[PDB]
């Protein structure tokens, strides 16, 4: 059985039943059954959101290289007002999140379509709706679940790297990759900063502190700039 | 019985001569704990091999490049072509990643003996690893382990201890005279009564700090000598 | 500790602490409200 | 058997190693009585947690002050916050005393009567205020991750880590107060001054700690 540390003993609460189980829990956060049940859904939702976000950022830079993703919320103008879009998103997200939360706390209780009584999701597990949500499932379910959780973890780390690279270099993912490929020995984080007992140098925050959006002055500070190496 | 580290001294109970190069020397009793003894043996082997490599590197470097000081060879401007004036960040990144991988593998081997012998990518590529700190196989392609491994291990630990003492000697000689081991030996051979530890001591030739490209690295001697 | 608290509960120690508290309260009142003659 | 504060001396009879961070340190026998010891355990836990929060906040603000972020020192942050923002100091004091009074009064009456706050008289909540042990209030509110209701050995290890970190944070807060009273600068400023010259920039050369120096 593959593990995050070959030759180590996995935790007792991690028996390898859940997909993506590699015996990684040094803090013992998943020891409780209810906590593990909640964290499983949290990881699945985080994985899917990060996967969609990373794919969207890459496609955004490929299709629109002149638009920075970090500035995408500012330099995008639509006939629909920002407050109207926020209201639409709030209502739709509230509806779907309440339905998902109710399915989590009460399994097999919101599988029925409230509009049409002839549509109902078949019995499933928490975090894996299926039915109308899965019109095509090519391959084994367990193998695909492992692939999904692994791709989701990679995408989560990728989004964190996207944010950090955008705050340190001020460029997109493809732009940062090209900049690093041009001079690999002088573009890493080690080449940009270093800390010693006599001096502590950190890279400057390329993101401006304030952003003017229709006369509102939205503050945009780099994530934990003081703790930057 | 084996010869101890001193005439008339009594070896400790835990030092029965099982390990190579055992002289019953433990004035601090640090080897009383078996787990601590195994960890200290691994640490001694690592120090021995690294010190042997350092001593050989300093000697070969002084022979091939006598115009380059080994103490200041770490500066980017003293690096050979085409690594001269290279970015130290990328170099540190390369070393950190590679050394971190190999040291984590070695550490896991120490925690769980015989559990990381197999290659994680190409299955079937394993090392025999008869004892801790002695992997063998790909690490010994010439096959010198199929014989008296005890005397060879004794030779290795003794040469490593001698190299540890020698490397510290090189460091103090460079910090007190400002020259390499061969240069210090030649200087002492020129006038033994004029160039020795009686007059070279008390002076620290190492500067206060050095500006490596952009950041400054503080430096100091092992003893409070005159800067 | 029980015996020490019992000793502190004796009449002279209790009287000393109580009178020190009462005197301190009166002194602080006269300090923050100097020369009070009438209500 | 267990390590004590002063090696060779037997630990006191009222300290048997059951509590977290037990090293038999009680030369004045302050916690000799069982009820007094229980009260002191809760006091030490509260002190350690408050000191941990204070030390972390002081270190973070000092880090932001050392780099060009505009953060103020810990001994001037209160004045800077009250003057920069239109915040009335007595109003903030009253609000904090109200919230702290409610939380501390509930904790106090739970100490006097264990499990009494679980009756449901506070908005119907019952299991969230039952309390696991003295000074360790488990539940879904104080422990949402459930690290205290799973892997008992890990829970005991975390208890030892918490009490030791709390004691270290208390010593750190005392050090912050003494360093500001002596040198007059921030804690990271003292750390940088010491790293610049450790042989001549310390408490033995500040001119305040040792008056005969
Ligand atoms: C998961 C969602 C999400 C994320 C990660 C971001 C991330 C970002 N947005 Mg959006 N946004 C998001 C959703 C949305 N943004 C906007 C509208 C805007 C605008 C108008 C702007 C941004 C800007 C920014 C950037 C600066 C963030 C900051 O410091 O905010 C600080 C403020 C908060 C964190 C919000 C307050 C607290 C929150 C919990 C409520 C940043 C890269 C700014 C930019 O371009 O900067 C360069 C900018 O001007 N976003 C809308 C409405 C359509 C969103 C709807 O979901
Ligand atoms: C986390 C998901 C996510 C989010 C928040 C965004 C957000 C944004 N994208 Mg983007 N995108 C995404 C995923 C996402 N995208 C993915 C996965 C792709 C690959 C197909 C793309 C490809 C893409 C392109 C090519 C472009 C953007 C652009 C933009 C920006 C303005 C466009 C807009 O929203 O107007 C409204 C968008 C529409 C009206 C299109 C129709 C909306 C469809 C029909 C909704 C489909 C819903 C879907 C089935 C449900 C999946 C939900 C899932 C994410 C959880 C905006 C900040 C534009 C930009 O760069 O700004 C200048 C731009 O050109 N995106
Ligand atoms: C782990 C021990 C060790 C370490 C840390 C070093 C470190 C170093 N050696 Mg060295 N060396 C060693 C062992 C070691 N050596 C041994 C055992 C030998 C004998 C074969 C040599 C023979 C040697 C020579 C002949 C030279 C160096 C040089 C150098 C310096 C430049 C690095 C380099 O060559 O570019 C990178 C190397 C590769 C990419 C491969 C560097 C500080 C060079 C120097 O003097 O710098 C000016 C040089 O000319 N070494
Ligand atoms: C063992 C007692 C002893 C002690 C306590 C000291 C102490 C001192 N010596 Mg000294 N020294 C000693 C023995 C000792 N020495 C002997 C036996 C010799 C003859 C080899 C010397 C030769 C010597 C020289 C040439 C100088 C000093 C100097 C100094 C002073 C500066 C510290 C330093 O790093 O210099 C040197 C450190 C050492 C010599 C290490 C001592 C090794 C001992 C023997 C280990 C036991 C310092 C107060 C320096 C000074 O006078 O300051 C201006 C200086 O230049 N010493
Ligand atoms: C029984 C005799 C007597 C009486 C009636 C008084 C009465 C008074 N004395 Mg006096 N005094 C006396 C004997 C007496 N003294 C003696 C024997 C001495 C020598 C030790 C002194 C020496 C003395 C000094 C030096 C001073 C007074 C002062 C005062 C006035 C202070 C009022 C006060 O304390 O504020 C108010 C007290 C309270 C509000 C406490 C209330 C208790 C609780 C907290 C509230 C409960 C209430 C419901 C007061 C009118 C002071 C003064 O200013 O004179 C005008 C003052 O300076 N007295
Ligand atoms: C009990 C310990 C403690 C105390 C007394 C303080 C006190 C203070 N902190 Mg601090 N802090 C602490 C712990 C503490 N902190 C810890 C553990 C951390 C994480 C390491 C931080 C990180 C931190 C940062 C980053 C900042 C402060 C700041 C401040 C000052 C402004 C008040 C404030 O927080 O704004 C307002 C209070 C709130 C926003 C709380 C919201 C109330 C909620 C919504 C009610 C529900 C104030 C003097 C700020 C400062 O430096 O002043 C300029 C600042 O930016 N703190
Ligand atoms: C909207 C006002 C505001 C402003 C102008 C700042 C500004 C700053 N904060 Mg900060 N912070 C804020 C709100 C704010 N904060 C709030 C409400 C919290 C509680 C969650 C924090 C908690 C916080 C921490 C823990 C730290 C900072 C730090 C910093 C400094 C480094 C840049 C940074 O933001 O890293 C980003 C850090 C974040 C936690 C991002 C959260 C801030 C966004 C805008 C959300 C706030 C919206 C809120 C709901 C209204 C910087 C000067 C760092 C510092 O002190 O330097 C040493 C630091 O470590 N802040
Ligand atoms: C359900 C269903 C069913 C039916 O039947 C059908 C259908 C409809 C099809 C469906 C759907 C699906 C979906 C949605 C999918 C998606 C996915 C994704 C997005 C993934 C990603 C995923 C993603 C991922 C992993 C990502 C990754 C990334 C990465 C690593 C990155 C990296 C980087 C960085 C950091 C930075 C730099 O500068 C660059 C680089 C270097 C490059
Ligand atoms: C046993 C015991 C126990 C009992 O109980 C007690 C007592 C007595 C305490 C004891 C003893 C101890 C001792 C003696 C110790 C010592 C050690 C050492 C010397 C080490 C070194 C060790 C050493 C070492 C590792 C070293 C290494 C080195 C190196 C790598 C080098 C490198 C280099 C080179 C090449 C050159 C170039 O240019 C640079 C560099 C980079 C610089
Ligand atoms: C045990 C015993 C018994 C026997 O028998 C005898 C003897 C020996 C006496 C003993 C001992 C004792 C001791 C040591 C004690 C100590 C304690 C402490 C230090 C505490 C602190 C403690 C401390 C603490 C809490 C602290 C806390 C802190 C805090 C909150 C802070 C805050 C803040 C901040 C953030 C910043 C801003 O800007 C300001 C402020 C606002 C300021
Ligand atoms: C617009 C009205 C919104 C609500 C206004 C404030 C009401 C807040 C009251 C919270 C409910 C407190 C009691 C909660 C549960 C009760 O204990 C149950 N009946 C159990 O006995
Ligand atoms: C600035 C001061 C504001 C004072 C705010 C007081 C808020 C109520 C405090 C009441 C505490 C009562 C504690 C119970 C006493 C007891 O248990 O004996």
From Swiss-Prot, chain C:
Q: Where in the cell is it found?
A: Plastid, Chloroplast thylakoid membrane
Q: Keyword Metal-binding on this protein?
A: no
Stored SUPFAM superfamilies: Subunit IX of photosystem I reaction centre, PsaJ (SSF81544)
Topology in the lipid bilayer is annotated as: Single-pass membrane protein
* Signal peptide start-end: none
Asked if Chloroplast is a keyword of the record, the answer is yes
Q: Which UniProt keywords apply?
A: Chloroplast, Membrane, Photosynthesis, Photosystem I, Plastid, Thylakoid, Transmembrane, Transmembrane helix
Q: Which GO terms describe its biological process?
A: photosynthesis
A Gene Ontology CC term for this entry? chloroplast thylakoid membrane
Which residue spans traverse the membrane?
7-27
- InterPro entries the record matches: PSI_PsaJ, PSI_PsaJ_sf
Family designation: Belongs to the PsaJ family.
Describe the function of this protein.
May help in the organization of the PsaE and PsaF subunits.
Designated name of the protein: Photosystem I reaction center subunit IX
Q: Which gene encodes it?
A: psaJ
